[PDB]
């Protein structure tokens, strides 16, 4: 209703969906239900162009996502920043013909990338419970 | 926000920046800080204007982080984002000692966690009980 | 599910290459320890445990403490033999003793103002007529407090202590006028009371409106400074309003029914003779009109100079009976080194000073955890059996810890306000505004620390956080892996699992589900070489150590990442040097920071930011309050000259206030600001008492100078009565010496000097102002 407290109403909606967040499909749940007091039209539409063509559109979108969108969102009064351009990302265009030629499946390529490219937990050299007799503690790091 | 093992750089670039991207534009936000330490833990303290309703402001922060709870690393998500109207100093510091040395420090901490901390928290007016001592646990010190 | 070590040790485990079925006890020492060994507790040097209770948002401290102590007494009964409960750190005792001291000074103020009014009227009755309005007005203020959602804190209590001498002003005026009428004209109490009312009904209302309107703008200030002003505003304003309602409603009835016929030591002739000498001196003053206006211009100049130059603060520090000691050892420090440092500090103040109990928390510290951080909450013995003060102790600890054990131990006092900051002093955040990176910010930071080491108004402006540290990053040679024939995932597993301390699932231990944590044993993860002694299965069937496939490299990186208002930052604590206020230090910090590389900004956080807001809105609170009083005055006396003559008395009250503060050596804190406004109000009160009657006598046909001197003489007695009343009522604030006495000292010194001035310097200047301002028009 017009003039209703948007905060408490947003709270009400959050409460109602909480009662239905355990029945949604697993992907939906582990993808989040972004509930926000929204708007319809864009206040303004900041953009980045490259007149000398020194940067392709992908580079512009990358720069915009990595170094502009965050600091635009960090402005007081900015409720949402929708980036019409995606951050850079390592794309693996597989070829199913060759995938079959060697006998592999995309699941295999998925496993090879998951294994040869892992995030190795750092650990800490000499963390408690320390061995009686230790005086140095260096935070280890792995690089996989 | 907890993210076990991970050093402060990871918590700083993968977790804190995300949450801070939504903390802005919250109602009556006086100032905001975020500290990530070596314990794989980040404390993001949004300090609001003096006299602002701490309940509704806490609600606002919950709403803002809800929009960023689907992008955090899986460990972070399945470890929970404990958002609480906090305080700085301890009101008092209840402790248990053993003058006759009949109980080692581990036994005291165990007894404190299992039979005292819960009933201390179950006192009216107690907002948080931080136990400086860990519950007992079956440790398996393997030998590589 | 297994429940005992026996069942865990006999856990089968297929042996990968040979076939033998081994048990878990073959490859692992199974034992019961603690989940995580993060924190330890040293209570009076002995190992123990603890549970820090953080108050609930907006709960009551005293009530919470009462509840927790009761629960501890209840749980004491079920403690096996050997365990003893203790509260080796408690703050609510101080809350209880502070509020009790404030109520005690309130009662002392009541007693002293009653003695003053008795000495000035000499009959218990005459002095009981006003002394019944203070408690009733106070109780009405309490009802309004409840209805508005307020509390009983030292702020509103201090407001009531200030009000004691302002509440009874109206009633004193009424009783004095009635007494005076019964002395001069001998009229019956009833009709004399009616005449006194028909005389001073409008003076009373004017005094009231002025006093209640001067306190209104302060409550409109933004920030904690306002949240502080609002207590004094609500308390004193509602107290003054109810005081006026009673002076107009109750005291007339009392003066009409229970005032006995005048029938009835040395004060009488001396006081009258004093009045006459004063009148002659006043006439001699009025003689030299311009010279006294010149003296007033000079006093206003001195006053402005003092209010502009004297060092500013926010809240006075107090000896809360305890302090903290943060030990920050370098990185690469082990819990054994911090135990040594804490043991040194614990043994350094064990039997030498008089402290109640010293509890240290190892591994925990405000602004960061880790093996190289501890915080020790030493609690001073008491206040009645003390020797050295909290600030005199901390200094001893600092100087007796800076030269012996490696680290950064810095004993620090508790803050002024409970949940603003953790320690007394200023807290700045050095921000990185131009993406200079972490190394640049840290270089700027240590430079700033280098510049703050040779400053005199600075003592130790240390870093409130964690320090940079050496990391050991391993580079994995994937080509050597493919040539050795070893899977990469196996190397990743071995590293991560070799350091991780992973948790698996629970097991029922004596009725409670407790965790089952696995972890490489202590002696196999201490030095780097141990890690480089782990082996993986190759391709040729022989094991290959990690040292052949991984190369370490040592970097220098910050171990704690701080962010403020979005940008990376570094918390820079600091405590001002002796004889230097917090305001001077803040201003000095701004200059220093101005001497830093480009792109590095600075922000005040907590007490510092609140103090900055106070200082940045003290002019508008005095500009708006003064203007409100002027406009109310002009409304009340239908003129533009009378309010000018009433306003011309404010600089004299500020003069005394500044004089008292400079002489006592206090600072320009918020309590002084509260007194500043209170003295504006009281000054205006003393002025109105004269100006109103002088205007009335001039309207009655009398000459301006004669009317002025007659009104001054006739109102000298109520003016001195009320003035001495409020001054002796605040004397308990100035002379207080117990615990939490510095807040009273700061809140009373200003109003004391200001009242002394706005009474000794008003009864001589307000006639001059009146005559000058009326003649000039």
* Helix, strand, or coil (residue C568): strand
* Helix, strand, or coil (residue C737): coil
Q: Dihedral through CA C170, CA C176, CA C181, CA C183, nearest 10?
A: 170
Q: Are C341 and C406 a contacting pair, CB within 8 Å? A: yes
Q: Per residue, what are the HEC states of C542-565?
A: CEEEHHHCEEEEEEEECCCEEEEC
Give the C-alpha separation, C688 to C630, whole Å.
12
- Solved how? cryo-EM
Give the C-alpha separation, C245 to C204, whole Å.
10
> Across the interface, which of C371, C476, C500 has its CB nearest the CB of A144?
C476
CA distances from C359 to C325, C365, C386, C559 (A): 10, 13, 19, 27
Give the residue numbers spanning the domain of C400: 322-412
DSSP calls for chain B: -B-TT--HHHHIIIIIHHHHHHHTT-TTEEEEEEEEETTTEEEEEEEEPTT--HHHHHHHHHHHHHTTSSSS-HHHHTT--------SS-SEEEEEE-TT--S-HHHHHHHHHHHTHHHHHTSTTEEEEEESSPPEEEEEEE--
Q: Which chain B residue has its CA at the smallest distance from A140's CA?
A: B7
Q: Per residue, what are the HEC states of C165-185?
A: HHHHHHHHHHHHHHHHHHHHC
Distance to chain A for C472, nearest Cα, Å: 5
First to last CA, chain B: 32
C-alpha dihedral sign at A53, A55, A58, A60: negative
> Does C174 touch chain A if contact means CB atoms closer than 8 Å?
no
* Helix, strand, or coil (residue C431): strand
Q: Show residues of chain C in contact with A113, CB under 8 Å.
A: none
Residue C172 has φ and ψ, to the nearest 5°, of -60, -40
In a mutational test of the A interface, the residue from B10, B15, B22, B25 whose CB has the highest number of chain A CBs within 10 Å is: B25
Helices C582-594 and C438-451: angle between axes, nearest 10 degrees: 130
Give the C-alpha separation, C522 to C703, whole Å.
100
CA distances from C536 to A115, A123, C168, C478, C541 (A): 16, 19, 89, 14, 10
Give the C-alpha separation, C75 to B132, whole Å.
19
Distance to chain A for B107, nearest Cα, Å: 16
Which strand (E) or helix (H) includes residue C252? Answer: helix C224-257
Residue C358 has φ and ψ, to the nearest 5°, of -120, 110
Give the C-alpha separation, B34 to B36, whole Å.
7
Q: Is C501 left (phi over 0), alpha (psi -120 to 50) or beta?
A: left
CA distances from C290 to A2, A41, C303 (A): 67, 70, 20
This structure's resolution (angstroms)? Answer: 3.5
> Does B25 touch chain C if contact means CB atoms closer than 8 Å?
no
Lateral strand order in the sheet of C550-557: A140-141, C469-476, C550-557
* Cis ω for the linkage preceding A129 (within 30 of 0): yes
Give the C-alpha separation, C694 to C646, whole Å.
12
First to last CA, chain C: 100
For C128-253, strand residue ranges (E) read none
**Residues near C27 by Cβ (< 8 Å), separated by ≥ 6?**
B142, B143, C13
Q: Show residues of chain C in contact with A76, CB under 8 Å.
A: none
The burial of C693, by beta-carbon neighbours within 10 Å (0-12 exposed, 13-18 middle, 19 or more buried), is given as buried
Beta bridge partners of B136: C34
State the Rg of chain C over Cα.
36
């Amino acid at each position: 209703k017009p003039g209703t407290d948007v905060e408490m109403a947003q709270v009400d909606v959050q409460n109602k969906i909480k009662a239905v967040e355990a029945r949604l499909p697993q992907v939906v749940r582990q993808q989040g239900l972004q509930v926000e007091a929204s708007s319809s039209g864009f206040l303004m539409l900041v953009g980045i162009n490259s007149p000398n063509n020194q940067y392709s559109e992908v580079d512009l979108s990358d720069y915009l996502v990595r170094n502009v969108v965050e600091e635009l969102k960090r402005v007081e009064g900015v409720g949402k920043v929708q980036s019409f351009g995606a951050e850079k990302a390592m794309r693996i265009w597989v070829d199913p013909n060759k995938l079959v030629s060697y006998g592999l499946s995309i699941s295999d390529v998925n496993n090879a990338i998951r294994e040869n490219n892992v995030e190795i937990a750092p650990g800490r050299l000499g963390d408690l419970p320390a061995e009686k007799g230790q005086l140095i503690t260096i935070p280890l790091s792995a690089q996989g | 926000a907890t993210y076990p093992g991970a050093t402060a750089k990871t918590i700083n670039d993968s977790v804190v920046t995300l949450i801070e991207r939504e903390l802005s534009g919250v109602k009556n936000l006086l100032y905001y800080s975020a500290t990530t330490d070596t314990s794989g833990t980040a404390e993001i303290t949004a300090t609001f204007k003096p006299g602002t309703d701490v309940e509704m402001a806490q609600v606002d922060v919950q709403n803002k982080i809800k929009a960023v709870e689907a992008r955090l690393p899986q460990v972070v998500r399945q470890q929970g984002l404990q958002v609480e109207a906090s305080s700085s100093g301890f009101l008092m510091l209840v402790g248990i000692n053993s003058p006759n040395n009949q109980y080692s420090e581990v036994d005291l901490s165990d007894y404190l966690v299992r039979n005292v901390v819960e009933e201390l928290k179950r006192v009216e007016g107690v907002g948080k009980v931080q136990s400086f001592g860990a519950e007992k646990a079956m440790r398996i010190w393997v030998d590589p | 599910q297994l429940s005992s070590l026996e069942q865990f040790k006999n856990i089968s485990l297929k042996s990968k290459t040979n076939g033998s079925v081994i048990k878990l006890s073959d490859v692992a020492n199974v034992e019961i320890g603690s989940q995580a060994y993060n924190f330890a507790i040293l209570e009076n040097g002995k190992p123990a445990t603890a549970a820090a209770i953080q108050l609930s948002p907006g709960a009551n401290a005293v009530k919470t403490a009462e509840g927790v102590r009761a629960k501890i007494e209840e749980l004491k009964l079920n403690l096996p033999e050997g365990m003893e409960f203790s509260i080796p750190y408690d703050t609510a005792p101080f809350v209880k003793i502070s509020i009790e001291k404030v109520i005690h000074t309130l009662l002392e103020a009541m007693v002293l103002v009653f003695i003053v009014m008795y000495l000035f009227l000499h009959n218990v009755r005459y002095t009981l007529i006003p002394a019944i309005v203070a408690p009733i007005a106070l109780l009405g203020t309490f009802t309004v407090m409840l209805l508005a959602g307020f509390s009983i804190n030292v702020l509103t209590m201090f407001g009531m202590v200030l009000a004691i001498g302002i509440i009874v002003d109206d009633a004193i005026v009424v009783v004095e006028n009635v007494e005076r009428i019964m002395a001069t004209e001998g009229l019956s109490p009833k009709d004399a009371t009616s005449k006194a009312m028909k005389e001073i009904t409008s003076p009373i209302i004017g005094i009231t409106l002025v006093l209640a309107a001067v306190f209104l703008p302060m409550a409109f200030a933004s920030g904690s400074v306002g949240v502080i002003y609002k207590q004094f505003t609500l308390t004193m304003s509602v107290s003054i309003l109810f005081s006026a309602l009673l002076a107009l409603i109750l005291t007339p009835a009392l003066c009409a029914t229970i005032l006995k016929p005048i029938d009835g030591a040395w004060f009488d002739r001396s006081f009258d003779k004093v009045t006459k000498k004063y009148e002659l001196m006043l006439l001699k003053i009025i003689k030299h009109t311009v010279p006294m206006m010149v003296i007033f211009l000079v006093i206003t100049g001195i006053t402005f100079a003092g209010m502009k130059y004297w060092p500013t603060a926010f809240m006075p520090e107090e000896d809360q009976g305890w302090f903290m000691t943060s030990f920050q050892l370098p990185s690469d420090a082990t819990a054994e080194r911090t135990r040594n440092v804490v043991n040194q500090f614990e043994n350094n103040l064990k039997d030498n000073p008089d402290v109640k109990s010293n509890t240290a928390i190892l591994g925990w510290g405000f602004s960061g955890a880790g093996q190289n951080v501890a915080v020790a909450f030493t609690t001073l013995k008491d206040f009645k059996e003390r020797t050295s003060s909290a600030s005199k102790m901390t200094s001893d600890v600092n100087s007796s810890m800076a030269n012996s054990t490696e680290g950064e131990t810095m004993a620090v006092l508790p803050p002024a306000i409970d949940e603003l900051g953790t320690f007394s002093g200023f807290s700045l955040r050095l921000q990185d505004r131009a993406n200079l990176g972490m190394p640049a910010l840290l270089a700027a930071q240590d430079e700033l620390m280098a510049m703050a080491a040779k400053n005199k108004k600075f003592y130790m402006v240390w870093n409130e956080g964690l320090p940079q540290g050496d990391n050991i990053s391993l580079k994995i040679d994937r080509e050597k892996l493919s040539a050795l024939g070893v899977k990469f995932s196996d190397v990743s597993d071995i590293i991560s699992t070799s350091m991780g301390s992973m948790y698996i699932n629970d097991f029922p231990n004596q009725g409670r589900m407790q965790q089952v944590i696995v972890q490489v044993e202590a002696k196999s993860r201490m030095q780097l070489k141990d890690i480089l002694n782990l082996k993986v299965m190759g391709s040729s069937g022989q094991l290959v150590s990690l040292s052949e496939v991984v190369t370490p490299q040592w970097n220098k990186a910050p171990q704690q990442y701080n962010r403020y208002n979005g940008r990376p930052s570094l918390s820079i604590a600091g405590i001002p040097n002796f004889d230097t206020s917090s305001g001077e230090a803040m201003r000095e910090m701004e200059q220093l920071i101005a001497k830093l590389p480009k792109g590095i900004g600075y922000e005040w956080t907590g007490i510092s930011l609140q103090e900055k807001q106070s200082e940045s809105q003290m002019a508008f609170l005095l500009g708006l309050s003064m203007l409100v009083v002027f406009l109310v005055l002009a409304a009340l006396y239908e003129s533009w000259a009378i309010p000018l003559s009433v306003m011309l008395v404010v600089p004299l009250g500020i003069f005394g206030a500044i004089i008292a503060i400079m002489s006592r050596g206090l600072m320009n804190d918020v309590f002084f600001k509260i007194g500043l406004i209170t003295i504006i109000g009281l000054s205006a009160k003393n002025a109105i008492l004269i100006v109103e009657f002088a205007k009335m006598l001039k309207e009655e046909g009398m000459s301006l100078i004669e009317a002025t001197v007659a009104a001054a003489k006739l109102r000298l007695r109520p003016i001195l009565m009320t003035s001495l009343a409020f001054t002796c009522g605040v004397i308990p604030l100035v002379i207080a010496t117990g615990a939490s006495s510095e807040t009273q000292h700061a809140l009373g010194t200003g109003v004391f000097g200001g009242m002394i001035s706005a009474t000794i310097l008003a009864i001589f200047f307000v006639p001059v102002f009146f005559i000058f301002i009326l003649g000039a028009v």
